[model samples]
Target: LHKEPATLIKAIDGDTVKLMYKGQPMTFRLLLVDTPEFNEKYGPEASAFTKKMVENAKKIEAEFDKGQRTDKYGRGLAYAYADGKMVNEALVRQGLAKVAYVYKGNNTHEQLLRKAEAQAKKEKLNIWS
Candidate 1:
């Protein structure tokens, strides 16, 4: 029960991961962000970018707010902190991933995400590129 927030140690797939929090193995979905499929265009870059971001995290926190969390496959939707910022947003902002709100209506970061996608497409990173 030592899940006092976390630091991302690995990105397992386009939609999953392995994390270290306190002293236990915890898993969470990077809320609000979804990239291409594991082997799809931009998938690897998206993963690599996310991994890099986590490794460079100066500060990361966790939150399980009420939203469309936990797809039928069972992954808890939560935020990962990086220097006090949401990692999900970071991914989108960097154009590594696209915002996919399949369930949650939380558009708190949608406009920014849409803009990010537009930018990504504009700049052409991985798939967009």
Candidate 2:
């Protein structure tokens, strides 16, 4: 995996967001995670929570898995960081999304995410509830 610097701009959904990278606007979808549709139940809540996590972040970072740079839709897949903490796993840890939803290739947080999901389920948090 490789990491890149970015500036958070907006949250398109719980797992998708816009950022300024290399002085240009770009879209990215969080890899190894999936949140509900915008129109679905708890969707807005997830998006709001994600926005809050990244709202004050000025210099965020993104890490991409090997073999793929962007998806067919042109959204780059990554694990984003806000204030040095991983926002991707935080969603699953907080029960905002599902883990292992799509790609998990070479993810350093794979086991951590799975563990968080398990705890979230046991705690009946958000989607797990």
Candidate 3:
């Protein structure tokens, strides 16, 4: 995977984050998953999970898919890693997020993410419950 080092500035929500990437500050929309919004069911829990993971990580990195780099809103479209663990997969495994927004031929981690979602579903965790 093509990865870039990043510094976490803030976790806007479960699936959105602000970071310093490539010498500039930017917002990134986490790829291949969607967490509930702040006002929706289990929203706060998801956001808190994301915040704690990123905030506590010794290092953060961004992995860009083979396709587009930015979303319609100009936020970078990428997967996030905290200390080598894929944060996107972690969210799915915890049932804080669901697999979503997949583009054909651009889902770099689709299988890994789907497996996590399945595990979360089986356990009935968070949103799955």
Candidate 4:
């Protein structure tokens, strides 16, 4: 969420990524989307989709969500963009993830995510099926 630019250094899973910011480093979890855990069903698919979607990115942008900057475990939380698309939204749109977090304040994309999940469910895409 720091306006400073960051590179998508690694996709740790469906909802986590490692980034290099101002020559420093941090890992941020995608704020609103939660994919299957690596050990759970559809986990691998989620990870692979994220990896492929952002690799060789033409653009990467990240923003902080409302409230805390990081989770209790110390992971940064933000909505990230790759190649001009919101990664969190993309994951839900594909059914690779679901709207699976609790938050307060004006969540920027709450309704958008809800709609995406519904469409994915209706279409029976990926994990939604």
lDDT of 2 by residue, 1-129 (tens): 667889887778899999888788889988888888879987988898888888977668988777476888998878898887888888898888998655546466678789888998999999988
Top-TM-score structure, candidate number: 3
Which candidate tops lDDT?
3
**80-125: candidate 1 lDDT, tens digit per residue:** 6666776677677677777786454644556766777787778876
Q: Write the per-residue lDDT of candidate 3 for residues 27-106, one digit (tens) a residue.
A: 99999999999899989998999999999999999999989998889999999999999999999999999999999866
Count of residue pairs whose backbone atoms collide, per candidate: 0, 0, 0, 1
- lDDT tens readout by residue for model 4, 1-129: 244467877879889989876576788888878899999999999999888877868778777766787788878788888877888998999999999785875276789899999999999998868
TM-score of each candidate structure, all chains considered together: 0.73, 0.90, 0.98, 0.91
Task: Tell me how far the alpha carbon of residue 45 in candidate 1 is from the true structure, in angstroms, after superposition.
Answer: 1.0
Better of 2 and 3 by TM-score: 3
User: Which residue pairs of candidate 4 clash?
Assistant: 1-64
Q: Candidate 2: global Cα-lDDT? A: 0.83
Q: Give the range where candidate 1 is weakest over 10 consecutive residues by summed lDDT.
A: 1-10
Off by over 4 Å in 4: 1-4
1 or 4: which has the higher TM-score? 4
Off by over 4 Å in 3: none
